[PDB]
Design a protein around this ligand. Structure first.
Ligand code: ACP
Ligand code: 2P7
Ligand code: MG
Length: 281
């Protein structure tokens, strides 16, 4: 193979890159090849049959090649925790970026829009993967102004074995909330929701108890942007991503050529630099 077989004797932790509900992420060295990677250890107790079925379902990641999807290196199981070795993005994810920034300005968000539309499009068309948890922490950035997606649901079983240990319940679309089977129209919703978040610099809904929220999302109408201070186009984009009825939501084709996308393509945004400025890179 490109990498052969991976065993965690070869890795030497370099720093901690962050962590969250389901584990921890280290920057690591792959001593025998030189490769710097990000290592993601997911603790799962499961019947071996079914962990090898996962460590193999993941090999599909090797045929994910796009400048908009984080790059894969392999996955091995070790003493309890399935490991996913992936490309290291020296700029953490937009969630860390939001913390430092406060808000992320519209123009930077149209570039992220492009990156997401396109990166979801790759996965949809080249591989029939729906993302499944599009949120700021799942969109990553590097000092080269690249913006890649990760933590999409490649492995049917990893998905299954994860639906018992609860999600970003908060980023789920209303239909998905009312029980519907995940559809792409849900990825879109969660994208929009993310953009609004990063635009406003906080979860865009009035603060309530978790259970109230879930019905709040099902019952009340969707977030919208403050309308004084964002282009009418942006407002439309987000809006179109956020129509509650999933049959009227805009889709990836219809989005790819929206006013706000086209305007953003044309635009010259030194995101790379903005970034190093913002988080001190
Ligand atoms: N390939 C990568 N390169 C650099 N940093 C990464 C990375 N993958 C993950 N990280 C960092 O570690 C953090 C932890 O990510 P992880 O997926 O473990 O939790 P999360 O931040 O997605 C939220 P949750 O745990 O609620 O889903 C990420 O926000 C990111 O900053
Ligand atoms: O880690 C996952 C996850 C879930 C299902 C699956 F199939 C995966 F491969 C996952 N991890 C994962 C996917 C692609 C890359 I490039 C790197 C990765 F680490 N999360 C879903 C939550 O949003 C967190
Ligand atoms: Mg994640």
């Amino acid at each position: 193979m490109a990498l052969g077989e991976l065993k965690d004797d070869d890795f030497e932790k370099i720093s901690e890159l962050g962590a969250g509900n389901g584990g921890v992420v280290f920057k690591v060295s792959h001593k025998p090849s030189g490769l710097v990677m990000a290592r993601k250890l997911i603790h799962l107790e499961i019947k071996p049959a079914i962990r090898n079925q996962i460590i193999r379902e993941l090999q599909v990641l090797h045929e994910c090649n796009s400048p908009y999807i984080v790059g894969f290196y392999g996955a091995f199981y070790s003493d309890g925790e399935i490991s996913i070795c992936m490309e290291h993005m020296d700029g953490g994810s937009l969630d860390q970026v939001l913390k430092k920034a406060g808000r992320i300005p519209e123009q930077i968000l149209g570039k992220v829009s492009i990156a997401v539309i396109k990166g979801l499009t790759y996965l949809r068309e080249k591989h029939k993967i729906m993302h499944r948890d599009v949120k700021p922490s799942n969109i990553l950035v590097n000092s080269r102004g690249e913006i890649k997606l990760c933590d999409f649901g490649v492995s049917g079983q990893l998905i299954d074995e994860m639906a018992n240990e609860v999600g970003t319940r908060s980023y789920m679309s209303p239909e998905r909330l009312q029980g519907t089977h995940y559809s792409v129209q849900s990825d879109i919703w969660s994208m929009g929701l993310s953009l609004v978040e990063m635009a406003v610099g906080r979860y865009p809904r009035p603060p309530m108890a978790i259970f109230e929220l879930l019905d709040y999302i099902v019952n009340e109408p969707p977030p919208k942007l403050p309308s004084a201070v964002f282009s009418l186009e942006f407002q439309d984009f987000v809006n179109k991503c956020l129509i509650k009825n999933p049959a009227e939501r805009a889709d990836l084709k219809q989005l790819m050529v929206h006013a706000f996308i086209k305007r953003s393509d044309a635009e010259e945004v030194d995101f790379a630099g903005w970034l190093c400025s913002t988080i001190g890179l």
